[PDB]
Amino acid sequence: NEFDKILKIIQKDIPLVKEPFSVLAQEVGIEEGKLLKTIEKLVEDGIVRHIAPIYDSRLLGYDSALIAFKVDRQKLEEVANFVNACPGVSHNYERTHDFNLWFTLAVPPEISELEDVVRLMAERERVKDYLVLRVVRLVYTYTPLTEEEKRIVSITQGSFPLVERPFLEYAKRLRMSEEELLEKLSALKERGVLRRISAVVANAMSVWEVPEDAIEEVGRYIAGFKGVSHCYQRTTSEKFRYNLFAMMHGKGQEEIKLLAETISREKALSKYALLFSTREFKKVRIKYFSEEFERWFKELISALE
Numbered sequence: 001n002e003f004d005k006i007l008k009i010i011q012k013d014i015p016l017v018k019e020p021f022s023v024l025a026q027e028v029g030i031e032e033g034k035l036l037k038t039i040e041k042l043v044e045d046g047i048v049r050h051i052a053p054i055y056d057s058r059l060l061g062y063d064s065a066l067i068a069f070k071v072d073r074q075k076l077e078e079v080a081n082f083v084n085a086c087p088g089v090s091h092n093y094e095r096t097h098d099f100n101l102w103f104t105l106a107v108p109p110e111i112s113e114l115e116d117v118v119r120l121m122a123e124r125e126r127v128k129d130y131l132v133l134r135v136v137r138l139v140y141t142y143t144p145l146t147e148e149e150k151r152i153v154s155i156t157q158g159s160f161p162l163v164e165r166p167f168l169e170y171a172k173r174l175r176m177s178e179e180e181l182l183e184k185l186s187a188l189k190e191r192g193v194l195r196r197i198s199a200v201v202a203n204a205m206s207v208w209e210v211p212e213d214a215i216e217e218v219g220r221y222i223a224g225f226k227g228v229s230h231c232y233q234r235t236t237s238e239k240f241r242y243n244l245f246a247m248m249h250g251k252g253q254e255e256i257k258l259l260a261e262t263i264s265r266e267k268a269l270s271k272y273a274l275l276f277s278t279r280e281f282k283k284v285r286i287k288y289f290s291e292e293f294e295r296w297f298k299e300l301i302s303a304l305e
Contacts, residue, residue, distance in 0.1 A: 002028070002030060002038070003038070005028050005029075006024075006028055006030075006035060006038055006039070006042075007042065007047075007048070009024055009027060009028055010024065010039060010042075010048070010051065010198065010199045011048075011198055011199055011200070012198065013196040013197060013198060014051075014160070014196070014197040014198060016167075016182050016185050016186050016189065016197075017182070018165060018167065018168075018178055018182070019032075019164055019165060020166065021035055021036055021162075021163075021164060021166075022164070032164065036162055036163070036164075039051070039162050039199075040162055042199070043162075043199070048199040048200065049200075050159055050199065050200065051159060051160045051162075051197075051198065051199035051200075052157065052158060052159055052160050052197065052198075053156050053157060053160065053194055053195075053196070053197045054194075054195045054196050054197070054198065055153055055157065055193060055194055055195065055288065056140075056192055056193055056194070056195055057106060057288075058142070059140060059142060059191065059192055059193040060109075060145060060153065060193060060288055060289075061108065061109035061110075061142065061144055061145055062106045062107060062108055062109065062288070063106070063107050063109070063113070063114045064088075064104065064105065064106035064107065064114070064134075065104075065105060065114055065132050065133055065134045065135075066102065066103075066104055066131075066133040066134075066135055067102070067103050067104070067105050067118055067130065067131065067132055067133070068097075068099035068101065068102050068130060068131035068133070069083075069099065069100075069101040069102075069103075069122065069125070069127045069129075069130050070098055070099045070100065070101075070127060070128065070129040070130065071100055071101050071125070071127060073100075075125075076094065076100060076101065078125075079101060079125045079127065080092060080094070080101060080281045081281070082121070082124070082125055083101070083103050083121070083281065083282075084281050084282045085296070086105065086121070086293070086296060087286065087287070087290060087292045087293040087296055088105055088106045088107055088108070088117075088286055088293050089103050089104060089105050089106075089282060089286075090104045090105075090106065090282070090283075090284065090285055090286050091103060091104040091280075091282060091283055092104075092280070092281040092282040093277045093279065093280055093281070094277070094278045094279035094280075094281070095205065095275040095276060095277060095278065096274070096275055096276040096278060097273070097275045098129075099129070099130075099131060102205070102275070103282070105117065105118065106286055107293075108288070108289060108293060108294070109144065109145075110144075111293070111294055111297060112297060114132070115132060117297070118130060118132055120300055120301075120304060121300075123304065124300065124303065124304060131239055131240055133234055133240060134234055134235075135232040135233060135234045135245055136232060136233055136234065137230055137231070137232050138219055138223070138230075138231050138232070138233070140191065140192040141191070143191070145193070148174075148184070149184070149188065149193075150288075150289045151174060151289075152174065152181070152184060152185070152188075153288050153289055154287075154288065154289045154290070155170055155173055155174065156170055156185075157287060157288055160197055165178070167181050167182060167185070201249050201250065201251070202249060202250050202251050202252040202253065202255060202256055202276075203247075203248065203249045203256075203276065203277040204247075204248045204249070204253070204256055204274050204275060204276045204277065205245060205246075205247060205248070205274075205275045205277075206245070206246045206247075206248050206260060206263075206272060206273075206274055206275075207242035207244070207245055207272060207273050207275065208242055208243070208244040208245070208246070208269055208271065208272045209236070209241055209242050209243060209244070209269070209271035209272070210243060210244045210269060212243075214267075215233055215243065215244055218244065218267055218269075219231045219233070219244065219246075221263075221266075221267065222246045222263060225259065225263075227248055227249055227250045227255070227256065227259045228246050228247065228248055228259075229247040229248070229249065230246075230247050231244070231245070231246050231247075232244075232245040232246075232247075233245070241271075242271075242272070242273065248260070253274070253276060256274070256276075257274060260272070260274060
């Protein structure tokens, strides 16, 4: 099936050449123009909703963490709206916990330390207790990006043009040739800053306290289960002693809670907690190196003073 073949192949890394659809069309065995038209339908119809470069947030120089605020219900919604305003906050959730506001913040380099940003947020919203958790899912080196790389990332991060020549418009905008752009794009891919270019209910964050010589096996054990999506790990701290996170979903706490007790039983982990998503105030993805954050931070300094 052409649909199957195409759908499968646009999820593979799209190559850094001038006419990458010419190449995918060859590999798929159909005419280029027809490959293009087909792609449109798949994005027009929403089984793939976007096709874009995937950059590595930390190799871009973004520090990012999961933040938790302890807010009381009268002021929960006020604070939540304030969080969504931050252009570097990708997700925001209300969760079932002492800390009832959980969001993901990511901060560009050379502006502020992440901890400063959350400090001023909690200060502005008069939140007394907050958590700053750095987790990691389941050889590359950080070099600060030049201003050009930042512009490159800035304009390329959107939807990948479904045209015969998809790096040409980008290159025109950046006043360089395709060849010079692809040159830079390839180097960022070799450095892993650029990973690839591709198309891509009832919910809880389960948090667990696990000995470190078991977290990999435990993580892989949990990763095998339906209802479990991604697994993450962090260090333990006095403010938060859970070191293993597992994203869970189902039909309700019921369908969900049950899928928890089991894990707790089969691996004897009595230390855990279920933070259900009762509300989502945001689920968008951040634009890297947009000037809207830096300013937003100004408005914040400006505000506070």
